[model samples]
Target chain A: VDVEERFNRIARNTVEIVTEEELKGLLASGARIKGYIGYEPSGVAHIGWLVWMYKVKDLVEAGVDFSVLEATWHAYINDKLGGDMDLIRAAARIVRRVMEAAGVPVERVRFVDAEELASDKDYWGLVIRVAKRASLARVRRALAEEAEVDASKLIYPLMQVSDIFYMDLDIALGGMDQRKAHMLARDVAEKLGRKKPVAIHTPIISSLQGPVKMSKSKPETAVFVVDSDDDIRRKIRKAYCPAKQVQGNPVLEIARYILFARDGFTLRVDVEYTSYEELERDYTDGRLHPLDLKNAVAESLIEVVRPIRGAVLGDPAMKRALEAIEGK
Target chain B: VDVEERFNRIARNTVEIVTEEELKGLLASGARIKGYIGYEPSGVAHIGWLVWMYKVKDLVEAGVDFSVLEATWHAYINDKLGGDMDLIRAAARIVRRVMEAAGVPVERVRFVDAEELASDKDYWGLVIRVAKRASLARVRRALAEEAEVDASKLIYPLMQVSDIFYMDLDIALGGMDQRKAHMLARDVAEKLGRKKPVAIHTPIISSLQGPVKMSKSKPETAVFVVDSDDDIRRKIRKAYCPAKQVQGNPVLEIARYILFARDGFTLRVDVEYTSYEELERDYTDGRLHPLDLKNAVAESLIEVVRPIRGAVLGDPAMKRALEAIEGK
Candidate 1:
């Protein structure tokens, strides 16, 4: 019964729990499970990031000890922030504060960076070992998938798989796009005779401009933790949400995934929405306008962003890091 | 005069010194040019390795400080010895004795194993650094060229380039095939504002199996330092040599490259020839039968191999290493 309760918390807000049965089995064995989400620390944590951030909160609530990998070297391999580690590393420093300010339990969370892992040869040993065990075709597919990749970009997936095995995590958290990498880790885990981590993937949301997924390159389409209230109001105001068109609407995605993240959550565009279905009923029936819903989301997003904004800006180093990246 | 003398010694048997002017400039500059040959210690030091072994003696004689990289991790990446590092590392151990026994001036040569380089993050730092500066298509081509490669195989060339830079070498020695990697090294060196090493490549000879290159997988096609006196005679006697065929004949190749490796070298068929052209003219025009020439070459090779064989087999550990690799 306790295991089911833990499963409910851990599984909340995720798109799919890869092998739900395996996950349940691990909980039943009364094992203390450790889980992780490795982020590339490419830029300012945005609203798209909040989806997984909330999942991390749920995981900790479910009694899984969680770690967040500030993938510094991984970002460098990705050619993030001009391949400048000092800037890349500084980009990661702001995240812990953002996690704390966003009401995630940072005191209970463990933060591991790539600096520590990449410093040791043993970690790299496993990287090559895992690469040898992995198929060339598989990694090559991951290659064409990156941005007109360099050969070193191939090491990105290997490092991701190594992060899972090296940390000995029981659960790997990511958006659905990471399913292939998790699958690779499982396949490699089989050959290595190591425990395959249960993959818990969250959903991806589209940009405010609609149809396309949120990206750092298109900053206006996504809200940032560093976004000012005015910034959120205008971005959401201009966000594409056709009236009575529920499908593929970025604002509605924000409504379902973020605004309705908590129970008894309310969105006061009309009378108010206690349930998303009730809001959807009014929304599709044309009783509620896209502008009203957009305004309501803007307000709700502001509420979420303000605390994280306050927390990060209060720190000098993080503020400067945020400033440097934003070119403020 | 001294500089030209050194150049003649270094330039004697090489297929090409990338730029003769660059080599002359470095020699004229009176710089202490350090050179290296990185060997993937996959198996016993065969006669194929003797070409480079003889070249190392030339480089040392020309006053270049030389290093022999065991390339243990490199061999492991290339999937040598079934990806077993212990066996791969052991395969590297016997080469030093062979170098000494083969008269490579062991006291003047520096030996570096991959274990030391791979152990440091700084080495890997340069690896990724070199990798980032390299074109993806270049490494991809190298991948297609490896044995049905895995992703890690891409790191092979990067590591090769990094080996030159990490050692800060002034000269990189190889057979004709390594030209591309050395070229990549020079290109990366240009961008990194580092010194580019002069590339010295030697010509390749065909296997005893005719036309195909000598490979450890086809041990019968090559002569190992460990080959017994009878092993030498039979392999040479059975070696592919078309009568009056100067090109692509393995016996005459041995005669030209190995027997003529020394001054006043002789082939004992028809009053004993003193020069390669003298020997070649005799062999190509049917003056020297394949049988008599093969016999003379075998005896000459035995004279060269016996000393190295005795030196290695004399040591208990090296003999065991040789035996274990030989499956004795």
Candidate 2:
């Protein structure tokens, strides 16, 4: 019953938005929803990933359809085949195990082999067609910052787009970072006379230092469920306190985008409003102690991450479920 | 012995040339050579194609070994599957009959289906591999004048190149317009560590007046071999012969490129010196007579095309050779 309801909310973590309601109508009618999410396991799973995982688990529980962890595929081709195959495979394994620990049913997800899919004629055809439509200059500009190596680096976005179509997806789900790929897939599908998939975008949820736009890449920036209880408490001790920065604080960038802009989370977003005014009012009034605010923020995070930590360390059933689909 | 040597040359037409020296040496080789030419016939064989056939056959009696022709592939695909099935049989009959009438042994040549060869991955891999090396932009620029309606347009050039590579050859002969494709194949072979094929670039022979270039689309401007004797004579008479134009006048562009630029012919490669001077010299002397030159040019063409005319017509054996191979 809980599983059925998770799919009802239709939460997702993707970057693409389809303006056409027609596609959403079709997926609403019954086409199974599926999407790929990259799983980087070099560090502990951050609160941001947990937010995405929450979205994934919600989709799975709702019975909207399949989800590919995308680790195996990225590991085999994008990472392993080109550079460090072993590291990629190990990273994929760790990520998959984490997902299982998080309560995503083994039956709801599958693995897509990037190498095997890349070699298909239809797949290559899509790449060629998309490449023709996109000018080298145009793609170069969009990906220049991210791609330090070959201009062929732009090919990956389209490959991600193809993955959506290849899965015969009605809906794609991913973090807001993946918006471009979802949009490209929608465009390509229309060009090829196929059904476009709807996109559902989600944001990261992490500690105060990590901001609402949480990324695992930043050091000591994310709240990991795997972190020790004492360590989690200590990290929260040193976090940037809005109360401490009285005049024009730097943390407002995160407060606006991650907390205020995020759906259903306006309080945190507004917490940094009118920097100078707030600093005088709150700091001079003595109502906003920087350490107290940090502690309060940490407490809230701890509450949110408590279930994830319990799932990871204490859930035997979750462990068994991961083992069932370990290599798949 | 001459007939056997001619057949051998036709077979050699099917051979791949591996190097610059190999292709050039073959051109300089004294053995009468023949060139093999095939078209998909997926569409109306364009006038550009006629240039190929004319050049191929011109080299045949001028010391060509084999004049191989293919019609069966089109028979199976275009004629048969396309609902004009009888065209397959008819094309075969027509091509072989034409070859025999030209005094070339129909038995020395071969016909193959494009689809048939595509079945072997190794055979067709050459087609895709070469295509992958060049981007679509480079290829499009190379084929700017032609239609870009189909993906096959890209493949067609590659096919032609690969055909030259797979078929062992002494000389890869074609009209001057085919210089790019011939050179491309020559380079492709060299890059792939294969021998380069020899190339014999011949002039684009045209009708008397030649509407810029002899085009079937411009029927009034073309004196095709298939045209009746009366039409041919009428075309030659109406052709673009200035009153002062005479023999060996390079200034007469039509006469110069077609008559002199050809291999084994004395036509000047550098038309500048001969252009004004040849016409002036011939006109000053008794050598400059438009009527006389027209008749002479017409007769020379008839003599040149006589073998093909005879092989195609007045020969049941030629018809039978084509018939046997076309549909079956």
Candidate 3:
């Protein structure tokens, strides 16, 4: 594809690209480009992660060399699964399977983990250098807006900043909540005389209950990508749709972030409308019932997740990886 | 020497040992105990560091294996010498010379630098683990009082804690200013299921200017071990000497911390008195002149540093180390 075409493809579904000019420059340069998004492997993959996974696919289509960093050590630092390394590594394996199932070209994209990546002395030196340059107050602010922020949480941003340099990334991709950390990386990179990465962000998928972002901890408020077809149906039926209102509605977000993007609104396999605009138009005017929309979303979601589920469950290696955690 | 005698030697000039019981127990064990004092290699080795170097000597006489850590990396984090590593490393080399010259039994005290100590992967792992356990507020409080504290300062205590573990120390020796950092190490050691080091604190020598602690940044306020006899004489003449007041008095501190401890009050080479009590008695009773006290302290300081200067300057290797920084 041409530079403009590549840029357009990469820009699609992203909330914002830090600087369009730098992105365009890289695209026009026609050199092999690199992009990365870090994931602190946790419980089963959910729709929230799928949002970024979709963006990962979009970047790949735009001809960017991409990698999914399974932040295993980060998960350890965050005390995921109670700081169990076995569980975190297992979760990382499951995430790779889910991403592959979600139509990420597994062969084209590289998968890296923090344990191996951080083993290098040079990488650690970079972490210390970055931390030295950052102000404590600035680093504290850059921490995710989670309650009870710990010291480990403060060091998270420093490690994330160093990851960009160590990964040799040209572009950093994440949810909009990651904007602060990305900006911190840019600031530190400039100070260290390293190339600053162009940051691209995707919108956070709100919780099924209200405007709050979806979280794995709130299982009733989020649909796991591995949720059974019946589970998806039950959750969507009970979900807060708020008739004729599209804003802050989790059901509509599912269609926008997952369903419509999957097929480009080409064929309405489950819904009456052929395009997302028509669906929104009908819903807004109260012509279309919430139940009909919920049904269509449920069906579309099942279709979206079916192959991913199969890829994870059917793959013998992945099944063994899961079994190890189950046995634990 | 017996354990009782060794205990007496180690206990001579120290302000407090965290636990006298622990020290007694260690002495009773008769194991070759290890002790360490970490110093950020900054400006010339001043009287403040000499106080600890003297403690190091006492520990050696007590049959403890002592090591002086040249905290070059710590100096870099604090932006010492403008973060010029060449200058910091050079400063560290000079410190070894001064330590040897001050009768530190150079053959007994092993000198280590932060660079080599932090290179071990296990050491970095310990740093992360310590940082993870410590709350930011707790780490912040452990930071030495300084203007405009930064993020690196927060990590300084964490690194110091890890050094205790990595060095496999039995006792952590430092001036009283190190109390907080040593306590932090003890706290973290309990969390990590490691041995809690016995902390020995030496009284901080007051700056010649006032009750404040001596510092390298204020050259006029401190008498450096490397300072010439004339420079020492001039600075001590203008030093703070309050008549009939021994408490918080810098000139009296010199006699008490240096002269009395050096010979165990058996003789007075510079002053007219034979013991610290006699010196304090005459000074506090308004019988000793301030100029007379300053002259005696200056002469004694000259004597105290005379051997150290010879050890540092007379040695060709140490002279080359000093030349490195001078050339830089």
Candidate 4:
């Protein structure tokens, strides 16, 4: 694909690109540019995580050398999954299976484990170098997590900044919540006499209950990729979808970002709307019932997740993965 | 030595002991306890630093297995001597010589280098473990560094806390300024299921100018160990000494902390007073002139540091250490 086509593909369904010029320059350079996204290993892959994988797939299709960093050490620093390293690593494995099932070509993507990378002395030297230059105020401003943060929380940002350099990526991708950290990576990379990674940020999906954020910790506000068909339907049925209003509507966003983008899943709302724009028009004009929209999105999501559940659970070793998830 | 004798020797001429009970119990146990003191390697080992060496000597004479940590990496974190790690290490080497010259037995004390210990993954694991337990507020409160600190400043405390555990120290020794960090070490050690080090704090000498801290940055306010005999005499002669006042007296403090403590140095005031008590009484009663007191302290300090200067500069290999200091 040409540069504009590649840039457009990478930009579609995303919130904003940090610098369109840098991204264009990277694509026009004609080098097999590397793209990276880091995920803190968690219990189950949420639908929001599936949207990120879709972006990864777009990068791969654009001829980018895509990689996923299972941030096991970052998760350990954040005390994610109760600070259990074994469970965190297992969660990473489960996430890869979900990514494959969700139509991301797992074979084409290189998976980087944080624990493996963190073992090298050179990697730590990079972390120290970044930490030495970043001020407490800069780190504090970039930190996304809350709850009486420890010094480890401060180290988390520096580690993330070092990850971009250590991986030698040309494009850094994450959700909007990761924007501050990505910007920090760009700043520190430039300060260290390295090329800044072009930052790509996707919009954060709102909570299903209409407050706070969509997180696995709040299971009611999110649908896990591993959720059974029944669980998806039940969550959608109880989801907050206001009539004649598309703002802060998680179901509408899910339909637009996921249901509309996929080929196999056809969202049919009372047989009145077939495409995402048609459904959005009907929902916005109060022509479609909130129940119909919820049901349609729920069924569409089930279809989208069906292959993922089958692929993840059908493996003989899945019981161990499930057990690890439970243990976390 | 008995517990009381060892306790008295260790207790004399110091500021505060974190817990007299802990020290007593350690001595009573009759186990060969290990003691540690950490120094950020820098040029200009001042008279304030000399007083710290006396405390280390006390620990050594108390039959403790004493060691000094050349915190070269910590110095790098603080960007001491303009972020030159080689200079920091060389300063650490010079400190050993100065310690030997001033009375800490060079042969008896084990030396630990920060760069050498930081190479182990286990050491970083300990640092992260400590960082995880320490809140940002707790670490902030413990930090003695300046405003607008870098993220490395946060890491410095965690590293220092880990050093106490890594060294398996029974006593943590430093000047009074280090009390906060040493207290943090004690707190973290208990949380990590390890024995808390008995914190031994020595008094800090006032600045020669009586307003700011006694730091190498303000050469006029401090007397460096490397200063020539003439430099020492001039600095001490110009030192802050208030007549008929004992409190906040920098010259009298130098006399008590360094000059009078040494064997060869006799603090004679107008050929009448030789002991610290006699000099203090004369000064407090205005019987000893400020000029007379300054002359006595300057001459006595000159004698005390003359051997140290000889030992540090006389060795042929001292050129390297001196070169490193200059490079810094």
Ranking by TM-score: 1, 3, 4, 2
* Model 4 lDDT at residue B37: 91
Each model's C-alpha lDDT? Answer: 0.84, 0.50, 0.82, 0.83
In angstroms, the error of model 1 at B270 is 5.7
For model 2, how does the per-residue alpha-carbon lDDT over A139-244 read when each residue is reduced to its tens digit? Answer: 4333423223322234456456666766677777776766766666666677766567777776544444623445444546555665666666776676655554
lDDT (Cα, tens digit) per residue for candidate 3, span B179-268? 999999987888887779999999888989875788876788898776899999998999988889888888888888887767754434
List candidate 2 segments past 4 Å from native. A1-8, A12-24, A27-47, A67-90, A128-154, A204-328, B1-328
Q: Which is the winner by DockQ between candidate 1 and candidate 3? A: 1
DockQ of 3: 0.37
Which candidate, 3 or 4, would have the higher TM-score against the true structure?
3
Residue runs of model 3 more than 4 Å from their true location after superposition? A29-32, A144-148, A263-274, A323-328, B1-3, B29-32, B144-148, B264-273, B315-317, B323-328
What would the per-residue lDDT of candidate 1 be over residues A57-106, giving only the tens digit for each residue?
99999889899999888888888888888888788888888888877898
Sort all candidates by lDDT, best to worst: 1, 4, 3, 2
Residue B148 in candidate 3, Cα distance off native in Å: 4.5
lDDT score, candidate 3 = 0.82
Query: Stretches of candidate 1 above 4 Å error?
Result: A143-148, B143-148
The DockQ-based CAPRI class assigned to model 2 is: incorrect
- 2 or 4, greater by TM-score: 4
TM-score of chain B of 3: 0.92
Clashing pairs in 3: none
Which has the greatest TM-score? 1
